[PDB]
Amino acid sequence: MDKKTIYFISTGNSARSQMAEGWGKEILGEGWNVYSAGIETHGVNPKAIEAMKEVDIDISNHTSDLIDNDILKQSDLVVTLSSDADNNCPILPPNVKKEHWGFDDPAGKEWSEFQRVRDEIKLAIEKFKLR
Numbered sequence: 495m496d497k498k499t500i501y502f503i504s505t506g507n508s509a510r511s512q513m514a515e516g517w518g519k520e521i522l523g524e525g526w527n528v529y530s531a532g533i534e535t536h537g538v539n540p541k542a543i544e545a546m547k548e549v550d551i552d553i554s555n556h557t558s559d560l561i562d563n564d565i566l567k568q569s570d571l572v573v574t575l576s577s578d579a580d581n582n583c584p585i586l587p588p589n590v591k592k593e594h595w596g597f598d599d600p601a602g603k604e605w606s607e608f609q610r611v612r613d614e615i616k617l618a619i620e621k622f623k624l625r
């Protein structure tokens with residue numbers, strides 16, 4: 495076998511976490527249930543959508559979600575993508591493992607910043623899969 499669950503969490507569920515969800519589903523889909531959420535939602539960043547479309551991944555149908563404790567409790571791995579999310583993460587259930595893979599916040603920047611972070615996230619997820 496049954497798939498494990500990975501939960502990407504960030505300050506918002508807008509850019510970094512949405513691109514992580516996009517890459518995660520594509521790369522980890524066979525053995526993982528992939529979800530993402532943020533301390534706040536903010537919607538799917540338009541530039542994040544364009545950045546992923548550029549690499550042939552459609553995240554335009556993703557939802558911008560808040561942290562669901564029901565999913566968190568059932569996660570094998572929680573990955574925090576921003577310092578804000580990591581520092582505000584409470585004591586987790588004993589069965590849950592947590593890793594922090596911080597990435598710069600592309601918000602308010604040019605396409606170029608979304609492209610950089612998009613690819614850094616891609617590399618991180620690919621290497622995770624190849625461990």
Ligand SMILES: *Sc1ccc([N+](=O)[O-])c(C(=O)O)c1
Pocket residue numbers: 503533561572574578579580582583584
């Ligand atoms: S892992 C994690 C990070 C942040 C927050 N938060 O509420 O800001 C949570 C949570 O409260 O469930 C979890």
Ligand SMILES: [O-][Cl+3]([O-])([O-])[O-]
Pocket residue numbers: 504505506507508509510511512532575576599600
């Ligand atoms: O919306 Cl973020 O995942 O970039 O915080």
Ligand SMILES: [K+]
Pocket residue numbers: 507515529530531556557558559
């Ligand atoms: K989501």
